[PDB]
Design a protein around this ligand. Structure first.
Ligand SMILES: CC(=O)N[C@H]1[C@H](O[C@@H]2[C@@H](OC[C@H]3O[C@H](O)[C@@H](O)[C@@H](O[C@H]4O[C@H](CO)[C@@H](O)[C@H](O)[C@@H]4O[C@@H]4O[C@H](CO)[C@@H](O)[C@H](O)[C@H]4NC(C)=O)[C@@H]3O)O[C@H](CO)[C@@H](O)[C@@H]2O)O[C@H](CO)[C@@H](O)[C@@H]1O
Ligand SMILES: [Ca+2]
Ligand SMILES: [Ca+2]
Length: 129
C-alpha cells in the first residue's frame, strides 16, 4: 500500500505535503486538514531524515504543540513523545510564550510563538492501497 495523492511524497506508509507560503501555525493546521491530512507527526529518526532533506530551509511548522498544558507537547496523531530532535536548549518557552514547534533549517526543533508567520509547513497522511 504505497499510493499518495498528486503533489504528495511517499515515505514509509505515510504521505507528506511540503506546503510553501507564509502561515501561522493554526493556519497550517487548517491547511493540512483542508488537504485531508494533519500537520506532520514525527516518530523516528528515519522519518525525520526524510523530512529534513525536503524541508524548507527558512523553517516550517510541524504537528507538535503544548497549548493544552504548558510544557507537555502533543503530536497531531496523539501518539507518544518518544522520538525527539530538540535543538539544544529548546524548548525554552521564550518571548512571551512559545507553544508551537517548528523545524529549523537543520531539522532540529524549536518551540515558537504560535502567531509567527513561517514560510513552510508539512502535512502527513496515511498511504492507501
Ligand atoms: C523585549 C525587547 O527589548 N525587544 C526588542 C528586541 O530586543 C531583542 C530581543 O531579543 C529577541 C531574542 O532574544 C533572545 O536572544 C532569544 O530568546 C531569541 O529567541 C529566538 O531564538 C531562540 C534561540 O536562541 C528561540 O528559542 C526563540 O524561540 C527564537 O527563535 C526564533 O524563532 C523564530 C520564530 O519565532 C524562527 O523563525 C527563528 O528561526 C528562530 N531563531 C532561532 C535562532 O532559532 C529572541 O528572538 O529582546 C532582548 C531583550 O531580552 C534584546 O536584548 C534583543 O536585542 O529588539 C527589537 C529590534 O531588534 C526591538 O524592536 C524590540 O523592542
Ligand atoms: Ca509553551
Ligand atoms: Ca524557542
Amino acid at each position: 500500500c504505497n499510493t499518495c495523492p498528486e503533489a504528495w511524497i511517499y515515505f514509509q506508509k505515510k504521505c507528506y505535503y511540503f506546503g510553501e507560503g507564509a502561515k501561522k501555525w493554526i493556519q497550517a493546521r487548517y491547511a493540512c486538514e483542508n488537504l485531508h491530512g494533519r500537520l506532520v507527526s514525527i516518530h523516528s529518526p528515519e522519518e525525520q531524515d526524510f523530512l529534513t532533506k525536503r524541508a524548507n530551509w527558512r523553517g516550517s511548522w510541524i504537528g507538535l504543540r503544548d497549548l493544552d498544558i504548558e510544557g507537555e507537547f502533543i503530536w497531531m496523531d496523539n501518539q507518544p513523545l518518544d522520538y525527539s530532535n530538540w535543538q539544544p536548549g529548546e524548548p525554552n518557552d521564550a518571548g512571551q510564550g512559545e507553544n508551537c514547534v517548528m523545524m529549523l533549517g537543520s531539522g532540529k526543533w524549536n518551540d515558537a510563538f504560535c502567531g509567527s508567520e513561517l514560510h513552510g509547513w508539512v502535512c502527513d497522511r496515511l498511504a492507501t492501497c
